[PDB]
């Protein structure tokens, strides 16, 4: 229904940073004339809605490849109370951007001793 996102997670102890890798999306819904969308991904760690990143916009595709990694300065021991949000939006030059769908990861469930890379279905906000 809302597409899928492939991402990965890691933690860098040398800089005390969470690494969020945004790989690609697939089967995104079309939101623009011509049957396509202009997707990008907004990435942030709740409850800090202020520190925020966006991938580049990939215009007129429903299957964008991003290959962008973002870093969040957060102490390892405090990660547990955070929730990572990866939200795919349709870019618009002129107006407020419409959300397509999102995936959330409660950080207390992440095992940094094993692989984290995966495809996940986007959900409505
Ligand atoms: Pb658009």
Please give the distance, rounded to the nearest whole angstrom, from the Cα atom of residue 9 to the centre of ligand 1: 28
Q: How far is the CA of 95 from the centre of ligand 1 (A)?
A: 10
Indicate the SS3 state at residue 125: coil
Other CB atoms within 10 Å distance of the CB of residue 6: 16
How far, in Å, is the centroid of ligand 1 from the Cα of 28? 12
d(CA 88, CA 100): 5
| Cβ-contact 18, 11 below 8 angstroms | yes
| 62 vs 66: CA distance, rounded Å | 12
Alpha helices in the chain (DSSP H): none
Taking alpha carbons only, the member of 12, 43, 9 closest to residue 111 is 9
The CATH number of the domain holding residue 104 is 2.60.40.150
* Structural domain boundaries, residue 77: 1-125
Ligand 1 centroid to residue 99 C-alpha, Å: 10
Contacts (Cβ under 8 Å, ≥6 apart) of 92: 38, 98
Distance from the alpha carbon of residue 57 to the mean position of ligand 1, in angstroms: 10
Helix or strand holding residue 32 (H, E):
none
Binding positions for Ca(2+) are 31-32, 38, 90-92, 95-96, 98
Round to whole Å and give the CA distance between 104 and 41: 13
Residue 36 alpha carbon to ligand 1 centre in Å: 8
- Between the CA of 35 and the centroid of ligand 1 the distance, in Å, is 10
For residue 62, the tally of other CB atoms under 10 A from its CB is: 18
Residue positions in the annotated binding site?
31-32, 38, 90-92, 95-96, 98
Give the Cβ contact number of residue 113 at 10 Å: 5
Domains: count for the chain? 1
């Amino acid at each position: 229904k809302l597409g899928k996102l492939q991402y990965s997670l890691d933690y860098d102890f040398q800089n005390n940073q969470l690494l969020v890798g945004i790989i690609q999306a697939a089967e995104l819904p079309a939101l623009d004339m011509g049957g396509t969308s202009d997707p990008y991904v907004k990435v942030f760690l709740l409850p800090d809605k202020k520190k925020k990143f966006e991938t580049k916009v990939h215009r007129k595709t429903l299957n964008p490849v991003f290959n962008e990694q973002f870093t969040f300065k957060v102490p390892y021991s405090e990660l547990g109370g955070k929730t990572l949000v990866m939200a795919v939006y349709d870019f618009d030059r002129f107006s407020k951007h419409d959300i397509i769908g999102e995936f959330k990861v409660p950080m207390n469930t992440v095992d940094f001793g094993h692989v984290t890379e995966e495809w996940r279905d986007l959900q409505s906000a």
